[model samples]
Target: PNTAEKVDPGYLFNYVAVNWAGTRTGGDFYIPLSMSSQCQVDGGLDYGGWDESVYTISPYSTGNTWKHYYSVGGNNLMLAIKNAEEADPVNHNAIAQCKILLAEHMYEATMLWGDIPFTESWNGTIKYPKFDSQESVLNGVLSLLDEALQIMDLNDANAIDEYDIYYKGDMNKWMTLAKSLKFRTLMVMVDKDPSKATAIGTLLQAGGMVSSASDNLVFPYSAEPGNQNPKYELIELVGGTQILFFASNYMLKPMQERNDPRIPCYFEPGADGVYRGLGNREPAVTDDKDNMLSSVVSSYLFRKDAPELIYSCQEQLLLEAEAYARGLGVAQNLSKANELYKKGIREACAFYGVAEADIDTYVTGLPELTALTQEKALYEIHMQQWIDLMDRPFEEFVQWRRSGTAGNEVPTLQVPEDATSKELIRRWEYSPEEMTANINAPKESPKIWEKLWFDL
Candidate 1:
């Protein structure tokens, strides 16, 4: 392990990257959120009492998720930012990287539990940090990202490639990532605070956001024993992949309904060569594909060296598509909205190496915004986003919450069966460790179905 000395931005950056990736891919982090959102169904590997759809409100929930969040935010991530400014004054690029990454980490936390330790947690002092409101945290996070964009100058020394897991220290990619994140961050807020429309408009006008798969914020892992994806490493640690996660019927319904071409790319066929999704928490869940099968998540999707996609061009374009459709910061124009909507699908299909002609056909066939009601058109945008975020389940979980419930629901997710509680889970409970150990933490954990601040 690298020493926690005064600086070494490279070492600190890589360390945080590895830790963050582990948490994102870990069963503890992904299982509850993903299952509740119906992004995935438990095939067999029932880790945290989630197979029955009961969100266990303990360290088993998001303990390690926040563990890494607090663990790295102050010690590794923020320290690197401080070290960069104090000693390597010219390394604004490094500082920019750290700031943007910190923004993302805080955003993830805010989405998970609404209020979280932001201001006090990262300071050199404040052992028992106060949980800042989601409103303040989200706004502050955007400010940090803005600072990142301002200081991210390629003219200065670039971050070392050895330390850069996502982009190999490419400032352009980092800038695009920053701009994309800025838009994404604003989107969750704009539902409650439409006043942010101007910022979203200005950000979109500035352009240069992630416009292609090449610009995606993806983390790659190696097949090397210790370097494989944390999820894969765990499966190997126990034995090998048994019946783990299967594509949920909730996840596959829209794609199948529309005859979406990317189905083959997204999932592997079952024993009988049919793409099947196990019913979410269905009582008779079985792995027998020979008689009537449930497809496992694609092997290529979860293979040792497979990459984790944090953001993609498909999301950016579809989001822009929604912006034009809703006139959020921009005038409502169904023509432009439809154009971008189709382009987003094309980009998604092309990213997976799906044939060009087929993608074109599917994109063209998609219903235009001009034909549907405004709410329905936005739902269309969210549906594609749902499919685009297949790999990023937690983000999809946030998306489900951000989109409305009742009549305005997108994909209209169903409640899990064989559940003790039938209510759709909203936010996770605070980790048990926080309740017992951190004096500033909540005395009792929040109920799993309690809505988050911005999740409305």
Candidate 2:
């Protein structure tokens, strides 16, 4: 009987934190760049990931944080699915949903780190496995999502509330989530193939994508210790004590220039009269903690542990806008995009308890916002997305890498020692242990700055 003992649910939850935070740590992804001191722990003052990558500095950290992220992400998903299934072996709806969650994280990691150990990784399969490319990984992840959705009893009466997390076992919501994810994966390829975008847009017409915040693919956190806000743990307790990261001048000054009210929620003006940040560069720096932007983390991020949002209505709308903008979906000119954007901002504001009058003013002033681009318009849409996605750093990073819309003023990191400048920064580097231990371990590539297939 001891042989059958199952792993505790707590272990799987740990995996969730590891993967989500990895996405945030990259400069290619940022949370609330509008304010300084929000999520900077780089400790370099000027050496945070954003500046490192953008300013062309090497991101070679002797520090173990980034590599550990890959290591944990490597197997966290599979472990979570295994644990959930242990609790319910046959048609366990919760386990299936967990599998879906795991798949998303797995695919997301691969997207950032090319040629990851997949087939032979994940335990009990092939231990010492070689890496798989992005194309192969995408196919596998999409297939996994499809399989989970097919067998899910969207109407299962026996689905218990305790096991369910996101959507709380609500079958309808889960179905919407599944379809929405499919849409996201499809949209990623639009630049490569417009017809592919249209093909997926057809699914949107069939009521496949998420339509409401209620159906938003979020995992709400419980108000419990250790389960609360991750930022608090990272900033207050973890190695982030020095607050090495400061606000980037490129992101914050622009928000202020536009008179965006969301600025107030993101940073605090220090004791001085000026707006300052934790590690902001000169001209923007102030001594007043009041001017410094405090970390505007998620509702459950560092507090009583709330569920992390996987996907949101706002994101779904963004996708819709992209689809319509490209003439892929039924809604044209983003008849739906503006609505979604406005609504998303409204929801975010409401959650932060913003005054209705402020919302009205901002929305009214930003009327030019839409999905289709006419030079500067695309920036507006994506910049808002960047502002709105202050909570999920991981997804934000991925989107920024793909969109590259916030403008070219954003910098890139220089190559590692012996690497040339032309090397495109593709994905995250492999962890030291993985490279040394795995039989299929890859030689250290040309340069960390080298670009991936999609990036090219």
Candidate 3:
């Protein structure tokens, strides 16, 4: 184990570099790039038909479906636990608590790809690599979380701090995160299996879910060297053509239609009473043009160059809205859901010091918002929640895929790149050199045509 003293906490940046360090490249450090491309910020440029490779590179696109891979934001947490365990898994309490965190991202990875080589994937050898179905990974990850919770010595004074980015070493928050994430995963399956949903609901009722933004899963960043928000730097340095991405029109138009105040934060309104961008050629042909609208940056977490929140009160509320819409879990009171929905906006606004009263007005009485039903509200909330995740594109991709509500395609536009070629991107083909050198080369063969596990 690399000594914590020697290991720069920034080691996670390696993944960022792998994905974003190059000419014409920028890392979506908080969200995954796959998300940004699919949501197609600034109309069509980022994920539009303009760049075929853009579609191919996306996990949500069909071209790269089978190429999907796994990643964990909780690496540091895992490292900390493994180091502690070397001393004594039974006595070294920190190790036990950290395991819950380690399980979170691994499970998140499996959600995107139905099967993943879990124990083997981390074993440092292609020889022993074995794929485990998504179900197995899910079960294993949940068990890991449960084990961590069972053994956590809540009396221990040592907290998460720098070791855990989201909760700042708060074990209680970590536990909450574990349970909330589990609830979220279970929510994904509710439509497929009611018994499973009922089981998960019972477990969730036992007191593991987060109740507020205070317990959100976020790794807020600073402007310090190597710590600035990934997109903060690029968006600041690049022209709109190079970096600015509009809230997807499909998503944005609804907000505009309702006069959502967050729209200003999500988009710039022209004096001419229209929003615009360079990405959508068709829209640009008529509506697109340069406008004073700056790229949306509303929260201090976003504006002050922070790492940005991950799972939050806003996300949880939105998920609740979905569950309620589906009649999966209680909290069925319409006002209860609205209270959360409004608070989510307030949270976003408050992060930027936007007035609390303003957030209330924005949430209340909006034409589109008032029209919201439980089933339809997730995307509405997601559209806003996701704006906070502008840099974390892949997060958006997975949400869109699982939720299927974010992007309402034009359908009439020239068939999207993958329309005839493949379904949604199943996975990213093996990275260039890895496939060539490893036995996995053939997996990359039907690169532009194969579907990944979930897409199937």
- Select the stronger candidate by lDDT from 2 and 3: 2
Tell me the spans in candidate 1 whose CA falls farther than 4 Å from its real position.
1-4, 44-52, 237-242, 283-292, 405-407
Off by over 4 Å in 2: 1-89, 123-125, 193-195, 219-223, 238-245, 276-284, 287-307, 329-332, 369-373, 405-426
Q: Looking at model 3, report the run of 10 residues with the lowest lDDT sum.
A: 16-25
lDDT tens string, model 2, 1-456? 122346654455445544454334333334222122122223233333334423233234311433443455535545555665566544455555655665676567666566675665655546687778776776666777787787678656544344454555576777788778877876665554455656576786787567666777654545466444444455555354324344443345556776767666554443344554333323323235533333222222344343456677777776665555445645455556666667766666654556899988877777654534543555566676666655555565556556652234122222232224444344556555666677687777435555555453
Give residue 5's error in model 1 in angstroms.
3.9
Residue 7 Cα positional deviation in candidate 2, in Å, after optimal superposition = 6.2
Candidates in order have lDDT scores of: 0.78, 0.54, 0.49
Best lDDT goes to which candidate?
A: 1
The candidate that achieves the highest TM-score relative to the unseen native structure: 1
Off by over 4 Å in 3: 1-38, 42-54, 58-79, 88-93, 124-126, 159-162, 236-243, 271-274, 277-304, 329-339, 366-392, 404-427, 433-456
Q: lDDT, candidate 1, residue 161?
A: 68
| Cα lDDT over the full model 3 | 0.49
| Candidate 1 accuracy as TM-score | 0.92
